[model samples]
Target chain A: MKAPELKEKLEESEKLIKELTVTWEEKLRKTEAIAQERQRQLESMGISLETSGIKVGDDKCYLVNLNADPALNELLVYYLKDHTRVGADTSQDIQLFGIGIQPEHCEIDIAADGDITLTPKENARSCVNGTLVCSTTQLWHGDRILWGNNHFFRINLP
Target chain B: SAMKAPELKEKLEESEKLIKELTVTWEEKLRKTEAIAQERQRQLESMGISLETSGIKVGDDKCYLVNLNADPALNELLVYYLKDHTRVGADTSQDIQLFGIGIQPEHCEIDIAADGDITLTPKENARSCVNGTLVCSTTQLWHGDRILWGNNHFFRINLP
Candidate 1:
């Protein structure tokens, strides 16, 4: 071929190749940006996030949502008394209170003296009384409380 | 002077082509080298071998690190030792053969005596000997013909 013609052909081919390479490179950058945006969306939705149990206070409350039978508590207490320790002593004693107390039935028990013991029963019967040395006599019952059922109290063993 | 102009242009084109070819070749060489290095790293991680001080030689599919001091029979012995280390969770019946007796299917090892009388040690644990004479127990052996000096025999028991 002619000299100038060959030079023009080579120059045109080089220009086309450069344009194609630039086009592909730009497409790759755009795709990478889209992938990054999708990952951000997942982060906002709390996807694949692990939460440690350190902040969780008493997971027993989660079980309450299932609404099981109230008698289950009495059955558990019966088994626990059989398997574990339960007795009374001046220095170290564990008294049982509110054996089958439900949330709805709230009552107060007044002893012969001015002292009172509160319970969750149809009739507020004076079931048991602790020694005078005990600071908290009215076990499982308090004024400032939000919501809960089945109360019990224990004196720290010396 | 008139012919020299075209010659110079051809030379310039040749030089540019050579530069492009060299760049492509070096880039390919770099990619291949990186791939080989990555494969080596992966092998080292899987095998838990350190390559810094050890000399490695690669064959068909396996890579071996040269350790002149390592005993050749160590791997075979390790397999034999690991068999007993497994937890047998249930009560299983096993047959036993007395030393210097006929061979059985469950026999795992052969014990050759000085008089050329051989006995088969059964893989099964804690049962009467096949000859109905005595009870066969778990036996552990060493590389030499002699029984291990101490802690050779293992006792079998039912799981709690």
Candidate 2:
């Protein structure tokens, strides 16, 4: 081949290499910036309560003390009375809990002699299994108590 | 020497240009790969699912213990540990009473005076009473006291 022709071919190849290099560098920088931005956004979102703990899974369980808070006790009693009837199927929202208070624990016992018993079992063990929002303690009838929100505790006695 | 001089010079220039472009491409690729790896590492660490990690603690003063393959009778007795205390007041009346007791499922009127010998019933229906008494059931006992017995059972007390 002639010298000028060879030199022109080399120049053309060099130009092609430079163009490819520039395209690769631009793509790399753009992807790097995108990845960094995604990292920042993920960090800002923070973790949820269930995720923060050693997640037991979608249905997290809690054994809470209903007697720890007065409002909870009242709410539990209200929940029980509102759902239960004399001889019908009660709902399953209330069930036996290993950790938190159950609505059934608030029952008033009636003896065979027509006498009734009022015993709001304090220091009760109530287990809650649901999407728990938050746990709060409040004052009820001059007593301090603890219970859960958005979690229902109930039982069936048949 | 003059005949080869220009060709050699031209070849050197071509190689230099090629090397420069290759170097920049390699640098860019390496930097992008490094950024991706670092981002993945950061995400795994934040997830707390990787090794050498920790998590947040919530709802203090509570625990979750599983009872695997527990028996019916044993579970029935275990249910007693779940009851709450019922405090009695001047304005309230006794609505329920424990007329008899059954230990080991043998029905008997044995009075369990050992406050630490009874277990609170799992849970009961809500009841408003005119009188103050410890509520009881055929298979459950509403314990009003928190006494950890050596025998792994709790005791009963009228709500004060």
Candidate 3:
């Protein structure tokens, strides 16, 4: 209603936004520097991420821990590769270490149409939901996977 | 309150112009901030630094290590899609998470060549193995090859 008052408020708001921008610029520089530093660190080590390829689009599927300690904060989203490995060994795509956890515990195959099939190693063990997985078993979304003694994860299909 | 209508209108016009400019500038700055933050996250993840945020939730088939957008609040562009890179570590940020004895939080980096070749590079002080040999430096991965990280974690690779 009052011209001066409104104009004054606008100016004040504008000033506040501008002030925020200053911090953003500083953060911009700081993180950008850190980013380049790490990237170059990889480059010097003879590993270049630019040459490798990743496909990002629709029809994504993943795995995640269902019940974890609330203090752990966040769990991981286990993205599906053409072939995802689950085992006691960290080399596998998913790692669960405990008694009876084999290095090559099991493998999940991803079809072009986003279908996931889990096959346990002949010497390894895996369970989907409550049933034991001894052969190639199709994994649907919401299936709870238990392997490596007792680690459990729920599959997500989206 | 005692001003002429003409003076009031002039003042309002000036205020509008100033406010409009500020709005646009603010938007641009906000977007820049988001881009920077995204790049920072990308960089940190690339280096095997696990983001404290919860694991990415995918309802279906997806690249497991790829970080999902938690908030679409301020991204302005679809450019710079560096979607390639396989990170291996015990941290949740890695493409492959190996949890066991001797597994480092940020363990290793794997890069692939166009000619169907894969290279494994171990991190400082971390242990990795290919086939039956322990790997302390960069090594090659071939068809039917099984690799190990840390003391007992293993992965078998297949390329057809």
Q: Which candidate is the best by lDDT?
A: 3
- Least well predicted 10-residue stretch by lDDT in candidate 2 chain A: A51-60
- Sort by TM-score, top down from the best: 3, 2, 1
lDDT of 1 at B92: 26
lDDT for every model?
0.29, 0.32, 0.58
How well is each residue in A66-136 modelled by candidate 2, as lDDT tens digits?
Answer: 33222211111212222222111144233433234444443333345433322333444222232221332
C-alpha lDDT of candidate 1 relative to the true structure: 0.29
Sort the predicted structures by lDDT, highest score first.
3, 2, 1
Cα RMSD of all models vs. native, in order, equals 23.6, 21.2, 16.7
Task: Fill in the DockQ of model 1.
Answer: 0.01
Task: For candidate 1, write residues A15-112 as lDDT tens digits.
Answer: 65566556655655565565566446434332221110001111111010111222221111111111122222122112222434222333333445
- Weakest 10 consecutive residues, lDDT, candidate 1 chain A? A52-61
Give the per-residue lDDT digits (tens) of candidate 1, residues B67-133. 1111211111100111122211111221121122232233344343454333435445423232222
Best-to-worst DockQ order? 3, 2, 1
Q: What is the interface RMSD of each candidate, in Å?
A: 22.9, 17.4, 14.3
Per-residue CA lDDT of candidate 3, range A1-158, in tens?
56666556555765765676676667667766766776565444322332122222223466655322221322344567788887767687766656777988999998888678999897776898889879899988667788756565667565
Across residues B1-160, which tens digit of lDDT does each residue of candidate 3 receive? Answer: 4665556667667766766786687578767766755664465455333422222322121122222222111211101122235777778787555566788988888776665456778888788878878887788765445566676555444332
Location of the lowest summed lDDT over 10 successive residues in candidate 3 chain A: A49-58
Q: Between candidates 1 and 2, which one is better according to TM-score?
A: 2
* Fnat of each prediction, in sequence: 0.00, 0.00, 0.16
Task: Give the DockQ (2 decimals) of all models.
Answer: 0.01, 0.02, 0.10
